[PDB]
Amino acid sequence: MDALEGESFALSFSSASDAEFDAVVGYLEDIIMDDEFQLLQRNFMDKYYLEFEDTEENKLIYTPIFNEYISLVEKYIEEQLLQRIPEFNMAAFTTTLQHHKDEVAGDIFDMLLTFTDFLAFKEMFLDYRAEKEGRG
């Protein structure tokens, strides 16, 4: 496939349009495949997947555990990005990302989606434990 697009796109300064946005997406993938990231993720997931048990009642332990993930993992990603971008805005980034999910690789964000999607977070752990029993 081949096309020609580039006339009314952007005025003169490209950034939040797709130039800078995409740039961030790249720096993200570099960390996702990063060895140090694989260790940290699996390290905490080893305990988290244990606490998250399929039950009919809701436990209060889910509140502290969740906050820990947002302060440990979510914060980790932010810090790593700021190391090169002191003017980064993770707040406005994530908000717009929700809609930009139509352009950016959805399969990739699906992982980060666990930032608020409690359904993806839980389903993620339950799926991890299922693989331990050999299935799929």
UniProtKB/Swiss-Prot annotation:
Effect of E74A: Decreases interaction with ARL2
Effect of F109A: Decreases interaction with ARL2
Result, substituting E56A: Decreases interaction with ARL2
Effect of M111A: Does not decrease interaction with ARL2
Phenotype upon changing Y76A: Decreases interaction with ARL2
UniProt keyword annotation of Nucleus present: yes
GO biological process, one term: maintenance of protein location in nucleus
GO cellular component: centrosome; ciliary basal body; cytosol; midbody; mitochondrial intermembrane space; mitochondrial matrix; nucleoplasm; spindle
Tissue specificity comment: Expressed in retina pigment epithelial cells (at protein level). Widely expressed.
Disease annotated for this entry: Retinitis pigmentosa 82 with or without situs inversus: An autosomal recessive disorder characterized by variable association of retinitis pigmentosa with situs inversus. Retinitis pigmentosa is characterized by retinal pigment deposits visible on fundus examination and primary loss of rod photoreceptor cells followed by secondary loss of cone photoreceptors. Patients typically have night vision blindness and loss of midperipheral visual field. As their condition progresses, they lose their far peripheral visual field and eventually central vision as well.
Subcellular location: Cytoplasm; Mitochondrion intermembrane space; Cytoplasm, Cytoskeleton, Microtubule organizing center, Centrosome; Nucleus
Main localization (coarse): cytoplasm
Any one Gene Ontology molecular-function term assigned to this protein's record: transcription coactivator activity
Family from the record: Belongs to the ARL2BP family.
Gene: ARL2BP
Highest taxon of the lineage: Eukaryota
Keywords (A to Z) from UniProt: Cell projection, Ciliopathy, Cilium, Cytoplasm, Cytoskeleton, Disease variant, Mitochondrion, Nucleus
Official protein name in the record: ADP-ribosylation factor-like protein 2-binding protein
Outcome reported for the amino acid change (mutating L60A): Decreases interaction with ARL2
Binding partners and assembly: Found in a complex with ARL2BP, ARL2 and SLC25A6. Found in a complex with ARL2, ARL2BP and SLC25A4. Interacts with STAT2, STAT3 and STAT4. Interacts with GTP-bound ARL2 and ARL3; the complex ARL2-ARL2BP as well as ARL2BP alone, binds to SLC25A4. Interaction with ARL2 may be required for targeting to cilia basal body. Interacts with STAT3; interaction is enhanced with ARL2.
Function: Together with ARL2, plays a role in the nuclear translocation, retention and transcriptional activity of STAT3. May play a role as an effector of ARL2.
